[PDB]
């Protein structure tokens, strides 16, 4: 059960990756989204609704 | 108009101290170290004496 | 009677440094300033690495590469005297192997 110091940084991030996914199984929490000026996927979709009214 | 306090009283009194009048023995209320620091007087002396030794060497 | 104008929160934390500037019309304002940054240091000898631009890492990515680096191998990490010990050491350890 002996590990190097350098391998222990990998096991922390792998532990902190599972904790990000188990949050979405808890009832009654607000959803985590991306920051708006970096999330380019939402800016494309809302603009598609925008010019649809123009027609 | 607004008011502003006059300093004509204090400008006169500061002139008599410039001749050394009002600094008696009966008008001191602090210690000798409070009115003049003893540490700064050593720094004034040792900085001037170190300057004049460089000029006499050059 | 003049009054200094303050805008924002009034706590004195690390990022809330302010100074007092005088306007042409006569106002007084407490303007905010940028966060204080320090010099980068060598990874081994721990001396101050000058000629590299010291700023916050957000603005540091906007600079040119000549202002981030020095024209030398390992120019971003080491001082330039530590590389002289490395090159002599790396060459001499090869000649010890060929004998033994």
């Amino acid at each position: 059960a002996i590990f190097s110091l350098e391998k222990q940084k990998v096991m922390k991030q792998e532990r902190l990756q599972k904790a990000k996914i188990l949050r979405e199984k808890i009832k009654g929490l607000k959803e985590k989204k991306k920051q708006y000026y970096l999330d380019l996927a939402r800016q494309k979709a809302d603009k598609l609704e925008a010019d649809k009214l123009l027609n | 108009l607004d008011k502003y306090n006059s300093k004509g009283r204090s400008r006169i009194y500061k002139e008599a101290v410039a001749k050394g009048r009002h600094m008696g023995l009966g008008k001191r209320l602090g210690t000798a170290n409070a009115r003049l620091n003893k540490k700064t007087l050593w720094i004034k002396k040792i900085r001037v004496m170190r300057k004049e030794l460089k000029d006499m060497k050059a | 009677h003049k009054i200094i104008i303050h805008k924002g929160r009034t706590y004195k934390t690390r990022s809330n440094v302010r100074k007092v500037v005088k306007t042409p019309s006569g106002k007084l304002v407490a303007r905010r300033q940028k966060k204080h940054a320090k010099f980068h240091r060598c990874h081994e000898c721990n001396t101050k690495l000058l000629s590299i631009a010291r700023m916050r890492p957000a603005e540091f990515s906007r600079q040119k590469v000549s202002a981030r680096k020095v024209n030398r191998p390992l120019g971003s990490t080491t001082c330039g005297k530590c590389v002289k010990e490395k090159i002599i050491e790396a060459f001499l350890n090869d000649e010890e192997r060929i004998v033994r």
Partner: protein
């Protein structure tokens, strides 16, 4: 009556137990060579730890008495015996001082962890 102090202290250790490092050394088949990198200090314990480097991997170990940064040590079942080296138990003559003894083979260490005790 009420619950006394002794039982109330142990259940306060189950709500927030104390944390330490438990430093162990690896196992290698043959004799290798490693270098001492740096010396640090932890919160709870008084004895300083040491970071050694075997095969480009950095582990943590308890520092022996005369140790300086950059020194070289050997680890193996048949290493020569000197200050700071780690060998098997049968090689050392009678009368010396050892400070990390595993109970069984291929374990980290069990006996002699604190500073000043040998």
């Amino acid at each position: 009556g009420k619950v006394t102090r002794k039982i109330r202290e142990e259940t306060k250790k189950l709500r927030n137990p104390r944390k330490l490092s438990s430093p162990k050394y690896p196992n290698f088949p043959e004799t290798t060579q490693g270098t001492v990198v740096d010396l640090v200090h932890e919160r709870g314990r008084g004895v300083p730890l040491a970071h050694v480097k075997f095969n480009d991997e950095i582990y943590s170990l308890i520092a022996t008495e005369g140790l300086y940064t950059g020194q070289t040590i050997f680890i193996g079942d048949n290493a020569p015996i000197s200050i700071g080296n780690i060998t098997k138990l049968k090689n050392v003559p009678g009368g010396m001082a050892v400070h990390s003894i595993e109970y069984d083979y291929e374990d980290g260490g069990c006996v002699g962890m604190t500073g000043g005790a040998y």
